[PDB]
């Protein structure tokens, strides 16, 4: 059965609620982004209205075969009317096509559902600036002060400089980047751009990228692995055995692999700066875990919430344990006392 924090009071709406069958009283299902914990349940057999971004709708149609007549894409930053209720989709700074959703309830209440997001000061100048928000359904993935990580721009500088140095020292080195979902495309696109290469990948992954409206994509990606010196592999294969096996398949073109695993947070964050990050090495294979996050750090989350000043916060992540829930509630009260709302 559908949990309460996926239901929007005073409407017929649910958010990211496709794995519970026919939800009682739901007239329109919203989908914030194309990540499997959120789309779980969707297919060609779905016959209710799904509301989403244009990019998410391309992925529903091509990857899951949802029929066109049930996909309702909405433009961003535009007031739209859905089953008699005004809504707005805003950029979530998560993966491609990911949105936050503002609902303007008929009784005067305003609700913001962040979906999954990486808070940023740029959000303080969207359509949020223009009215009060009463309730916030908040992505609390990293809601504890131990979660620090660098900006995306610092992480990409490290990756580009690392790859460019390695391949300039050894033109026979292959670079490999792990992936298992959409998101984090800058990692592999920035490395390919510095090296003067396209990114090579499976036909299934190429299909997924072609759904994303990324400009000049036919220029940056390919299925011809033999012409590429940056390869994308499933995340599961980014280990010494998987990589040794891949290097065999390349037929003596290469004699070294430099591989990247973009994780979210790892506890090497609490002791080490990005500049100081080192790989795991075995023989002619090196693996770098890089802290490229598409979720708010603690400080970024705190800043957003203290700017927005909601009357009530409903967490959507880490809600399954009493210890997690109690910890989160204590930070919310701190933020409110420090800021004065």
| Residues found near Ni ion in the complex (CB under 5 A) | 35, 116
Q: Which residues contact 247 (CB under 8 A, 6 or more apart)?
A: 174, 254, 257, 284, 285
Question: Could you tell me if 262 and 177 are in contact, meaning their C-beta atoms sit under 8 angstroms apart?
Answer: yes
Tokens of 78: 């535009």
Angle at CA of residue 331, ends 327 and 332, nearest 5°: 115
Closest Cα to residue 294, out of 114, 157, 93? 93
Minimum distance, C-beta of residue 99 to Ni ion, in the bound complex (Å): 12
Quick one: 38 or 198, whose CB is closer to Ni ion? 38
Q: How far is the CB of 232 from Ni ion (least distance, A)?
A: 19
Quote the least distance from Cβ 116 to Ni ion, whole Å.
4
Beta carbon of residue 142, minimum distance to Ni ion (angstroms, whole number): 13
Q: 37 vs 334, which CB is nearer to Ni ion?
A: 37
Tell the smallest beta-carbon distance from residue 94 to Ni ion (Å): 6
Residue 17 or 176: the one with the smaller Cβ distance to Ni ion is 17
d(C-alpha 251, C-alpha 249), whole Å: 5
DSSP 214: -
Nearer to Ni ion, 116 or 185 (CB): 116
Nearer to Ni ion, 51 or 254 (CB): 51
Please, what is the minimum distance in Å from the beta carbon of residue 181 to Ni ion? 8
Query: Which burial class, exposed, middle or buried, applies to 210 when counting CB atoms under 10 A from its CB (0-12, 13-18, 19+)?
Result: middle
Query: In terms of Cα–Cα distance, which of 323, 320, 276 is closest to 144?
Result: 323
Q: Specify the residue, 96 or 310, whose C-beta has the smaller distance to Ni ion.
A: 96
Q: What three-state secondary structure class fits 341?
A: coil
CA atoms of 180 and 176, how far apart (whole Å): 14
CA atoms within 13 A on the CB side of 267: 0
* Complex with Ni ion: residue 228 or 293, whichever CB lies closer: 293
Q: For the CA atoms of 258, 262, 268, 274, what is the dihedral angle to 10 degrees?
A: 70
* Adjacent-strand bridge partners of 179: 234
**Min dist. Cβ of residue 68 to Ni ion (A):** 25
Minimum CB distance to Ni ion smaller for 174 or for 300: 300
Query: What's the min distance (Å) between Cβ of 85 and Ni ion?
Result: 25
| Sheet strands (E) in the chain | 7-8, 13-15, 28-30, 50-53, 71-74, 80-82, 85-91, 99-104, 110-113, 135-138, 173-179, 199-200, 221-222, 230-234, 256-263, 280-282, 285-291, 312-315
Q: Given the complex with Ni ion, which of 167 and 301 has the nearer CB atom? A: 301
**Minimal distance in Å, beta carbon 139 to Ni ion?**
8
Under DSSP, the state recorded for 249 is H
């Amino acid at each position: 059965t559908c949990p309460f924090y996926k239901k929007i009071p005073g409407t017929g709406f649910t958010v990211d609620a496709f794995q519970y069958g026919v939800v009682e009283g739901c007239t329109a299902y919203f989908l914030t982004h194309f990540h499997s914990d959120h789309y779980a349940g969707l297919s060609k057999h779905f016959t209710f209205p799904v509301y989403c971004s244009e990019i998410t709708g391309n992925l529903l149609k091509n990857k899951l075969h949802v029929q066109e007549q049930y996909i309702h894409p909405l433009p961003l930053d535009t007031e739209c009317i859905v089953n008699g209720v005004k809504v707005v989709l805003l950029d979530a700074n998560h993966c491609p096509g990911a949105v936050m959703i503002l609902f303007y309830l008929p009784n005067g209440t305003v609700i913001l559902h962040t979906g999954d997001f990486r808070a940023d000061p740029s959000m303080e100048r969207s359509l949020l600036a223009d009215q009060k928000v009463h309730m916030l359904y908040l992505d609390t993935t990293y809601c504890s002060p131990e979660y620090t990580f660098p900006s995306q721009q610092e992480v990409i500088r490290f990756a580009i400089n690392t790859a460019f140095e390695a391949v300039t020292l050894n033109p026979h080195a292959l670079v490999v980047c792990g992936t298992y979902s959409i998101g984090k495309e800058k990692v592999f696109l920035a490395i390919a751009d510095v090296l003067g290469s396209k990114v090579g990948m499976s036909q299934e992954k190429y299909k997924t990228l072609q759904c994303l409206n990324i400009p000049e994509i036919n220029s940056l990606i390919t299925t011809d692995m033999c012409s590429s010196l940056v390869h994308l592999l499933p995340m599961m294969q980014i280990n010494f055995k998987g990589l040794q096996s891949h290097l065999k398949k390349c037929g003596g073109k290469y004699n070294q692999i430099l591989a990247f695993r973009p994780t979210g947070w790892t506890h090497s964050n609490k002791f080490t700066r990005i500049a100081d990050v080192i790989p795991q090495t075995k023989g002619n294979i090196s693996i770098y875990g890089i802290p490229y996050s598409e979720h708010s750090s603690y400080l970024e989350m705190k800043r957003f919430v203290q700017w927005l000043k909601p009357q009530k916060i409903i967490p959507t992540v880490n809600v399954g344990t009493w210890k997690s829930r109690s910890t989160m509630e204590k930070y919310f009260r701190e933020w409110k006392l420090e800021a004065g709302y």
